[PDB]
Amino acid sequence: AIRDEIAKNTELSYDFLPLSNIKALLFFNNEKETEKFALERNWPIVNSKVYFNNQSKEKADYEDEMMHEEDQKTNIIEKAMDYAISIEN
């Protein structure tokens, strides 16, 4: 469970880690284990460097995709309409 926890955290903290710095934080002692998790957690480690900002986009994008979506974005036009109708109730 702990491996997953720190892997969420590092999205905020970093955008760049070397392989050595990734290995310590996820509490791995083997290099292949770090690269094994990185594929399954969907970290794009290319040239031994992660780009967590790609990873933030995915998680943010997932929060929008769920249909609630009109009032989640919150329309400029919609605020003014709301204000108006309450006065004219």
Place this chain on the structure above:
Amino acid sequence: IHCLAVRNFKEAAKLLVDSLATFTSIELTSYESIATYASVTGLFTLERTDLKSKVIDSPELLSLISTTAALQSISSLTISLYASDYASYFPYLLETYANVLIPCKYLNRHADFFVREMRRKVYAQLLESYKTLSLKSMASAFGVSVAFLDNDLGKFIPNKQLNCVIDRVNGIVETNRPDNKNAQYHLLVKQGDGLLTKLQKYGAAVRLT
């Protein structure tokens, strides 16, 4: 002098400037102490420009000259803030503690309160005027070492009455105080929240009865 003994020196300032212009000595502690009181409140309440015109709108303060230790120590400090001397400022701060605050009946409640507040002001004005400073130079201006300087600053910054941050790697001091539309916005909402609260309780109370 009642306003002086409690924490509102703003009122104290407004009453004691009138007392310079005309003083009534019977039953009231003597006129050199009254100068010392005007000067105490002046340093706390005002800022450079206002302070300068106050003590030139009082000719009597300058013509009385320092004629007692307490008057001397406060007046030395008055000049240096508005003339934007920082160099000899930091020693004068110590002198005021010794010869005004503890000897006085009413400022002995303010011995720790004054020194704490007065340091914010002197830093504030310099930081507002600068986007960035270097720490070593800022330390030299006052006459302290680099490490020593942070400590005082670092109590004032999270209270957020100094609106700044300190890089310890560049060694630069960043100033990121809004003074635009963003500041007015930030102040206004607190009052408007206050109005919401006042109405929330009073509303309920009348409706139930």
Place this chain on the structure above:
Amino acid sequence: MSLQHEKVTIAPLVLLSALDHYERTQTKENKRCVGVILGDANSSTIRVTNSFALPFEEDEKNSDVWFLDHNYIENMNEMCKKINAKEKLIGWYHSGPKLRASDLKINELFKKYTQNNPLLLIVDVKQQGVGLPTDAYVAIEQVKDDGTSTEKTFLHLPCTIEAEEAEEIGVEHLLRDVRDQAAGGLSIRLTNQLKSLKGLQSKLKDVVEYLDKVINKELPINHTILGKLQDVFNLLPNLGTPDDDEIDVENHDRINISNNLQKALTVKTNDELMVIYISNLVRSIIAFDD
């Protein structure tokens, strides 16, 4: 002839009078009432104060065949001076739903009596249009730079109204509607706001299908129209401008004023809440006493 024009101002009387004269010639079904148009000109703004019928026959077999009684027009004008000596021919009205190509040949005849290019004012009798039920043209002859010959053609000008104050209150007196297409309170202008946006839709539709009609059904490629269309795009905003970011800052500003205004209203009504409670509070005693 004045070859300088800009706008047409119309008195309200003109429209109503052509509808009256229309039903009293009993015209319909390509027989269309045509009378003379009276008013001020030698002015860029054509100011039409009045209109009257002429004896006119329109053949429905051919509209290039028409009758106009020329002699009558001179006699009528002398009586126009009796009413007011500052009314002259400035064109002629058509009562039909739209522009005919026999209207160009008709326009020729009124040139003889006008010091201004003659006006065509279409007074509809079905009262169409999302603004005024009048369209306005004036005939202009010009070279066309599209490789086509010199036309006389009816070019559009804006329509506006100039109403005498005396007359205008008669319009209000007559009219028992509380007006939902003109300004009022919040709700009334809330309709006016939606109404304008729905007006833009209808107008925006017609351009799209005109452009389709040109490259499949082969309507003239008219450069003058399409040039104004190029300027629509150049005057059209682009996202990511600091001007359109300033709009966001300016939104905050007026909404906040509404926010404080809304609080101010809420305070004031809570004074009346307490008043009425003080009125109930006294009236407990009065009831108990009885």
